[PDB]
Symmetry: D3
Subunit: 92 residues, 6 copies
């Protein structure tokens, strides 16, 4: 009988101008848990411009060269644990 994984620090919303970078972070209740990030409900492919990072209880997503079409919900799920927040891309 083991505890389900929980979100200790949820995702916060990010604002970013076109071409700049957005960073998201979430902290889980326990280290080394596997999860998956989505943007506007579509799973993210890792790329030079989309970097998926894990370090202990922390999960980080780095989105470089953000574009207007990217505005919408960023979400993360690792088993039971789920969090979501808004990404707003602005022009100047």
């Amino acid at each position: 009988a083991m505890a389900l994984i929980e979100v200790e620090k949820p995702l916060y919303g990010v604002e970013v101008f076109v071409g700049e970078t957005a960073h998201f972070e979430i902290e889980l209740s326990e280290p080394d848990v596997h999860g998956q990030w989505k943007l506007k409900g579509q799973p993210l492919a890792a790329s030079p411009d989309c970097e998926i990072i894990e370090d202990g209880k922390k999960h980080i997503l780095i989105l470089h060269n953000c574009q207007l079409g990217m505005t919408g919900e960023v979400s993360f799920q690792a088993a039971n644990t789920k969090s979501a927040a808004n990404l707003k891309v602005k022009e100047l």
Copy 2:
């Protein structure tokens, strides 16, 4: 600044599994600690008790428990510019 592309050193290979059995896939990259993404039939896979995604140094492993007929198709993996694919054949015994 001069860095080698990530390459596949040992590629995915095909597996045949009977229904209800588990299948495992593995690939070895040229560099350790490279983030990898797995897909089955073109759909990105997420970790769960029956779909375990494993990373250890240069090795990437996918374990699929309780395989079902409808899972037959291409398993693919991508890590940086490194890509590999092989077939999952589930047989009805």
Copy 3:
């Protein structure tokens, strides 16, 4: 007390094929050691010893008749064993 959450399970393989064992512990990053027939296992191309979080994995490639026997694992205080059966096709 570090516990075993999902124990080793037995596996059957044909000669030449690969066998995989797996165990899930209650805690991640615990140093694990594997044995086959009571003999400690070193990593090699045909014997791959994997750790990722709570999961420990042993992959045995090109299995041979003489390898039939008990596969066992220990991490801190937790122990688990199961059988490898290699058979001719």
Copy 4:
């Protein structure tokens, strides 16, 4: 035999944030699993809730929450032989 020196592959670049927001810095090394040290205005950074030091593979990240005008200055990183610096500007 010959071992390559660790190099900076993707250097630190400057970040500008407004007072009270968080700034994220990012550097990529030529090799994974290299132990790195961060500094802000020449002082070694101590990991905290507001000051998070992250490593994953070739990637090293520094997150500074609730930035203050007094924190404007040079952020530097060093790992083995590799060094990078960029500016944190907290904007009024």
Copy 5:
């Protein structure tokens, strides 16, 4: 969530070494993957070839090569809440 503070499961022990020799310190925390900082005589340690900072799961290690007499003093470690200290004594033959 409601999380336990990091604790010290096994504290630093004192080390004594002759000059030129290496000292090794070891502390075990209650949780793996916790980030910490080492200090020597109250000063943050920079990680040269002679000063190696190591982490593996719940264990944190400091290796100091080529110890000199000036290094005699308190070695401390801090990871969030968790803190420990022990004496380094450097002796002349």
Copy 6:
């Protein structure tokens, strides 16, 4: 897939230790995340409270607590290709 063999970059050094104290061995390989095996007098080490096996990037470390006279002899490490050996010398104060 055209890959370099793992090599020892920093070999094991010999350690002298008094009875009851702890000995610390370290070796550095040419690549991080390589799996290896430690031996004492040609016998594989079983990890225990007094026998700790540590990995961190290119570094491999062995910690032997509460050293006893009978433990004197060769300590070795091998990672596939790579092998290094050094002497453990336990003495009475």
